[PDB]
Design an enzyme around this catalytic site. Structure first.
Site, PDB file in Angstrom:
ATOM      1  CE  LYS A  25      -1.806   4.370   2.511  1.00 52.61           C
ATOM      2  NZ  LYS A  25      -1.498   3.110   3.979  1.00 52.61           N
ATOM      3  CB  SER A  59      -4.554   1.215   4.082  1.00 53.15           C
ATOM      4  OG  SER A  59      -3.191   1.458   2.631  1.00 53.15           O
ATOM      5  CB  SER A  84      -0.886  -0.069   1.227  1.00 48.92           C
ATOM      6  OG  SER A  84      -1.964  -1.101   1.215  1.00 48.92           O
ATOM      7  CE  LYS A 114      -4.409   1.974  -0.499  1.00 47.69           C
ATOM      8  NZ  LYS A 114      -3.893   0.871  -0.413  1.00 47.69           N
TER       9      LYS A 114
END
Ligand SMILES: [Mg+2]
Ligand SMILES: [Mg+2]
Ligand SMILES: [Mg+2]
Length: 248
Positions: A200, A96, A36, A39
């Protein structure tokens, strides 16, 4: 010279944004699955599209259906199909949400979005060791999104310098969507490390527990990268150690 840290992470680093200096590096050139963390590139491209008059925050899009049962998704916890681009962007960065990311990528470039992610990687100066495979970072046909701590620093630094407002979202422990649902941040260090305002998380069995952190103190910003720590707790314990080095 550089400190002797004992981290869970199999690859880790912390860098000064102002001059690019590596303050600690461990396996910084090693190619690693990033899940992720992908992203962040999708976020970059969403934010570019809005600035370039190619996307509006109030467009309403339909969440794509995921074929992976174990993947985090906005639909699973809300049972609402249709969301604003704003709310999809928030869900992607905060909780997420994989379906939110895929939906945004589809809107921007259809099935060709991974090519645009990799085009932007090149345009921004990332190395040949980085390859994106999907807007979410979910594997595609056995292929994984991969990068290095060095390339992830570059992506994160470019995202923050070009779109500083990204931190307005990533600094929030909870985001109240425009639809009404409240989303909880996966970043457990918000409010625990002074100055920390991003960035993140990622997790799969293959990638382990991952986190890109960023904090600013006294006008100096640092970005930390943790890849493949052993538990969710350990990725943040590692980040604490890296932030200590970063501001030493
Ligand atoms: Mg631009
Ligand atoms: Mg922007
Ligand atoms: Mg492993």
């Amino acid at each position: 010279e550089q400190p002797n840290l004992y981290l869970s992470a199999n690859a880790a680093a912390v860098y000064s944004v102002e001059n690019g200096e590596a303050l600690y590096e461990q396996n910084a050139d090693k190619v690693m699955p990033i899940a992720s963390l992908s992203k962040l590139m999708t976020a970059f491209l969403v934010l570019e599209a809005v600035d370039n008059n190619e996307l509006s925050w109030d467009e309403k899009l339909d969440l794509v259906r995921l074929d992976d049962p174990s993947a985090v998704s906005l639909y699973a916890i809300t049972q609402k199909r249709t969301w604003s681009v704003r709310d999809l962007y928030s869900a992607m960065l905060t909780m997420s949400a994989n379906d939110a990311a895929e939906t945004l990528g589809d809107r921007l470039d259809g099935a060709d979005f991974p090519k645009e992610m990799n085009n932007q990687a090149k345009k921004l100066g990332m190395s040949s060791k980085t390859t994106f495979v999907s807007a979410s970072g979910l594997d595609v046909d056995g292929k994984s999104a991969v990068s290095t701590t060095k390339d992830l620093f570059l992506l994160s630094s470019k995202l923050i310098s070009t779109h500083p407002e990204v931190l307005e979202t990533t600094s929030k422990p909870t985001v109240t969507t425009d639809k009404g649902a409240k989303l909880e941040s996966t970043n457990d260090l918000l409010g625990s490390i002074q100055g920390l305002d991003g960035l993140k998380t990622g997790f799969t069995d293959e990638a382990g527990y991952c986190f890109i952190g960023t904090a600013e103190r006294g006008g100096k910003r640092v970005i930390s990268i943790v890849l493949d720590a052993g538990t969710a707790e350990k990725r943040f314990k590692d980040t604490e150690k890296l932030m200590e080095v970063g501001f030493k």
